[model samples]
Target: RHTFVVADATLPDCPLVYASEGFYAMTGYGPDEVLGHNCRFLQGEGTDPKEVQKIRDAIKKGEACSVRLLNYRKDGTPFWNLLTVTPIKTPDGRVSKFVGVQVDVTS
Candidate 1:
């Protein structure tokens, strides 16, 4: 419902559903390598765990929450983002998907 233009809810169990442009811009990973996989794979040895936990908590509550997440760019630079993911529901009011909006906080 959130006009993200690239969310694959079919893999709801996955961590992040990214747009085609998002994958290219964020990690230089083509759709083939990253499309079917969760975004967690992009996070490496030094990635932030605290941020991941916050997102997990929000998802657990099935509510919208905001947090500053430390993520890596395609070139390996770290950037902080204000990510807001909202749960999408079916016509009968059953949550069936998630809509995410990410804003880069790095100047």
Candidate 2:
């Protein structure tokens, strides 16, 4: 029902700096297994390219957006997930980081 992770926008390729336990419930991976890569690894073939494009657009502009994308868990099962990304701006107004929350909507 709830999940959270933070990405450092200033870092090259925008790496995931940390993830919470709520994220572990949906992803089935702990920090040791999930770190060193970005969340893009969780996307599957069934995931909509258009939806991902929207996410990319928002990230490029350092804007917040909500999109429903198919996300694959560590076990390889796909689930409908809502990705809400918010930008954390720096003191000088640049987006220094982004906050992402995952919410699964499945029966």
Candidate 3:
């Protein structure tokens, strides 16, 4: 299954506005807890800074990018996530939102 998240660039920290049910199922966090926070909440000690930088670079460029990285669940269990993020542009061609899809790829 896939999890989806929507982030509003107009908000502070690009906080999540919406998170799909699959996201809750995957992370063991309720929608209420996931909202208004950046996905970095899922990061843990094993998370790679390099991979995070790639995502940051892509977001800075307002481009779509995919990164396979480690993430932690609410209970602090680690898993591999294939995460893809895309910027949603406004009519003026400026990024106003971001949509992210995550899939647990750990095997």
Candidate 4:
């Protein structure tokens, strides 16, 4: 529950724009190393394809999304990530970037 991320909806691959230092406390990648990367970097050998696809579909629907995901740290340690997503609105009634609240559900 310690990490906060801001991702782009306008970008090519839903890349990240902001990430909390708390994310560094868990995963070890700093903002500079991860600025243009998507959540796929957090996946590892054991990450589930089904779960990943589910989230992709969720975001593609262009609505609210809440999913509990399987992600690995830079050290390859497994961690549970629950990310809640919502689109930020523009004054012209257009959709802007997406804001995410990620929680670390410790095992």
Candidate 5:
């Protein structure tokens, strides 16, 4: 019943700059290796196609979406995660950056 937390990202998707204990505890990527990559890097060859499609569709429609998908840890262990992602729109109403929140529900 231990929940982990990560702070707002300083860069795009770096476990380092965010530097949250939860980042390591959940994803197992350290500060150096995970810095400067999209959090979707957690996805691997075995990622669910439908789940990945859901995120892609949301981006295409410029809407926020949440998907529960199978993802991998740094050690190559597979786990289930709930990822909620929303696009941050700029003043021009265009998506500027995507904000993703991930939670581990693998018990």
Candidate 6:
């Protein structure tokens, strides 16, 4: 399923600034619960570090990237996440925010 989230590029760790209902429902987290934290909180021991590296590389370059990795829900249950992150650039071409779309592929 398609889910959506937005994060502030100016914030420390690019903390989540907005999340769609689908994102909250999929992860079982409320807006207030995730607002100040980086999305890495969803990752756990089972999550692949290589996948995380890919994401970091893309973010550092201000480019879009896609990865399939393991993520945990609020209840600590594991799920496969197909995640795509895109940088939101301002008029001067500086990144101002990031928008992510996630799909749960775990069954």
Per-candidate total of colliding backbone pairs: 0, 0, 0, 2, 0, 0
lDDT of 5: 0.68
- In model 2, what is the error at residue 83, expressed in angstroms? 0.9
Which residue ranges in model 2 land beyond 4 Å of their true spot?
none
Question: On residues 11-71, what C-alpha lDDT tens digit does candidate 6 reach at each position?
Answer: 7588998898999999999988888789998999899999999999999899999999999
* CA lDDT scores, all candidates in order: 0.61, 0.88, 0.91, 0.80, 0.68, 0.92
What is candidate 2's TM-score against the reference? 0.94
Indicate whether candidate 2 or candidate 5 has the larger TM-score.
2
Per-residue lDDT of model 3, residues 9-41, tens digit only: 877578899998899999999977888888899
Q: List the residue pairs that clash in candidate 1.
A: none
TM-score of each: 0.70, 0.94, 0.95, 0.87, 0.74, 0.95
Expressed as tens digits, the lDDT of each residue in 3-99 for candidate 2 is: 8899989876778988988888778888887766778989989999999999899999999999999989998999988889999997899999999
- Prediction 3 TM-score vs. true: 0.95
Model 3 Cα shift for residue 98 (angstroms): 0.4
Residue pairs that clash (backbone atoms under 3 angstroms), model 3: none
Candidate 4 lDDT by residue in tens digits, 1-107 = 47888888888678988888887777878777788888679888777788788778867776778877888888788888887888786888666787878888865
Pairs of residues clashing in candidate 5 = none
Regarding TM-score, does 2 or 4 come out ahead?
2
Deviation in angstroms for 28 in model 1? Answer: 2.3
